[PDB]
Amino acid sequence: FDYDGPLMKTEVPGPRSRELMKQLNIIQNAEAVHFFCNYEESRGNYLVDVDGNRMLDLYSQISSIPIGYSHPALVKLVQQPQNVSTFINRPALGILPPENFVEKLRESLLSVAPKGMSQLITMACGSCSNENAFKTIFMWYRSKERGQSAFSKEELETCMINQAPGCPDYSILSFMGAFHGRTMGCLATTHSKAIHKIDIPSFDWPIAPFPRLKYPLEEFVKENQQEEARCLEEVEDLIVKYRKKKKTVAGIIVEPIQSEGGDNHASDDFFRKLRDISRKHGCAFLVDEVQTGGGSTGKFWAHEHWGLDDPADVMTFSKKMMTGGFFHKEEFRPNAPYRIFNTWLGDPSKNLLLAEVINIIKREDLLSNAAHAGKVLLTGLLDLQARYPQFISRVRGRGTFCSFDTPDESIRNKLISIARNKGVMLGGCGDKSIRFRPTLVFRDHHAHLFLNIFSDILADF
């Protein structure tokens, strides 16, 4: 189920959107709002707004809508009378799970478990996924140190009043350009944009450089090899340095592709070596697939491209997955209950939808489709780069997870704004990059639709 193409009636945001934006602005800061949407009339790759505009959506609610708007298979789930309870009786999952909790996990998340990770805990978003992944890692690392010994009296007393040794001074190593959420734990590992970080208390945790590749890749083989090697060495130096400061690095967190910080890529070789460094120093390797997970790179999890039997110790997810959570190795299993815990731990209604999402992905061969449609997209971007080097540079991607840079922030926003008025929703990341996050029902013909619109925009820009 999909429309034949975009259809614009007004500038965006249009009159009805601007009116709803003014109403909402009374109650909260609404400057981020792009426009107001008619989700009821939205279908497949097309988002319809309240002014009747119908746009090809290559941003997908910031990479969170897996198989398009109003998918008929999802419609049918909500229509089934047996599913009513799931939507209106939300359980405290940690204590009172529903009968079908394990089976529905088998139909959904367990059927796509990463290699070597038998454990799974669910969470409602990417932030509590990473926060609880951090805690799982701290618990594991302390467990290694104390061995078979019990918690000590001193630890039980001091931990209640936020003091060592009960509350250790351990760290998670993160990368410049990273984004892992905005709760105060996650935020410490985030290094995306100053407006995200400023005025908020943080943690003194080590921050390593993420490789900046030069393009085109075939003209910078040696330079990119040396850049990645410099970054890996600086990661290792930081682990050593923080051990000496007695702020031991318990874990390393990284995105397979840095999203909010500007679609920064690195070679599979780089991630394989980073994983080895993690193991070498006893650091848990935490891979954040909140935005890369769900198939858009051509594999269900982006880390699968690395080709490792032991890719990671913990892996977080959300967005496309409908629910959050994290897979992990058996050895990271909490020793006691009520340590990794909260009221809802996700939502069974989201698991119900996800099981069907995953079924659609497999039956409609959507992983391979993302590789194919992404290849068409990227080929077209490379052509546009060759024809408009004054506006387009550093064209890059994997699957439909693509992007390019513009000369400055102002042109970037202008091109997004023109594209939108011409029927194509694009996203921005970093200071001057445009990014693509198409849903999994985006095909080679949607890529051409976009490419023809953007070609005309560029010609008289």
Place this chain on the structure above:
Amino acid sequence: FDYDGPLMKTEVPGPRSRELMKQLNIIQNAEAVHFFCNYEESRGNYLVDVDGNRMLDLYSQISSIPIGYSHPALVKLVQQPQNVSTFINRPALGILPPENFVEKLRESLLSVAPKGMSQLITMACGSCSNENAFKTIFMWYRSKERGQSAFSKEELETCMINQAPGCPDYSILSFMGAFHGRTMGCLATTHSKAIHKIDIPSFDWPIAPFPRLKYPLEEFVKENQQEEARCLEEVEDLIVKYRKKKKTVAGIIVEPIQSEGGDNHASDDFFRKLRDISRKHGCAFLVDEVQTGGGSTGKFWAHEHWGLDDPADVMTFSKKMMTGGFFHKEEFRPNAPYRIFNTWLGDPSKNLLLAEVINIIKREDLLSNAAHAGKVLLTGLLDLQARYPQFISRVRGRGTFCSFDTPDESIRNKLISIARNKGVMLGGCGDKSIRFRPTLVFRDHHAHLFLNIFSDILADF
């Protein structure tokens, strides 16, 4: 719609529950699981399990089910064809809200706004509500320090690498016995149980004593006055002490009644004075109504009992309210977008349900019913206390938000376990307290039902 009473077939957990518990334990630590539930057959005050047991539920998924299981008005919402899109098309609310977003907020959360708070931001749970309330407070504090001037270059650079002055060393003051969530920010303000806190890095923030009242209240007027006065003085000393340490207290967080820490109450006078101390020192007063909010104390928000025109600067909520979020004063409104932000910011499907919940609460006069049924409950508990002083002490409550202590942790768990096998789900809090969190369709005839069952339990104990 409700059953006539409990009906037990087996001990709890029964065979089918124990089997499902074994399956779940492969994938995660499942020791917290009480039993598995048949939500499809649950109605009103009665939770039905997978072994056919039907129990009067006075715990309500840890105080998160507002108007009982399978409420007919909520069933009808899910059955409406126009509501399908809301459940299957989840928006990135911060950028692309649905057409009805503001109106549905008017039907729900804005209709129950606390006094003096015109602003509202939504969140998906209690933990991100408090985390973002903390950040809202830190931003407000720095903003009042810097005035109507720009971010400095030094601040913009240092904040990206987790350093002052971009990342200030400010604090939130919290109370012993408190519980505000388990993400690393929230967890710093939590002082409930050592298993919650141990092995997790924390923040050096001030921790004040919460008053431990003596019962019965009319025999300890002077002693409880002096206990509360001592606590208020210690709060103020801590604010002064942390100002000198250059870890300025930007805000104070408190529950109107401490839940997870053991149902600790204080007088309305105490909270009024705490609010005054907050204002006096320029600290934002953050009231956490995640568990007290939604009517069970006899007012929609528990802080309403205080009778203040200016009760707080910020107020968080979740659980009963379906979605999370927080209300706040206009002056706490963020100056720029993308500071308080995340992908989903709650869920429109939860707002849809909440609008109906609130309509039911008002039309069925459920606030007044909680006061009355709670009075019947508490009167019965006082009678049982008089008859069984060897097992029951410190009977206390407001509305149906009631509790009592037992002599030790072991008897507490034993009485919960006996009660459950006799058809009544009770909750525990603190080390040795039993607590009540009945849904809002708990009537007095349910109170008598409980009191008659438990009275027989105590005679046989």
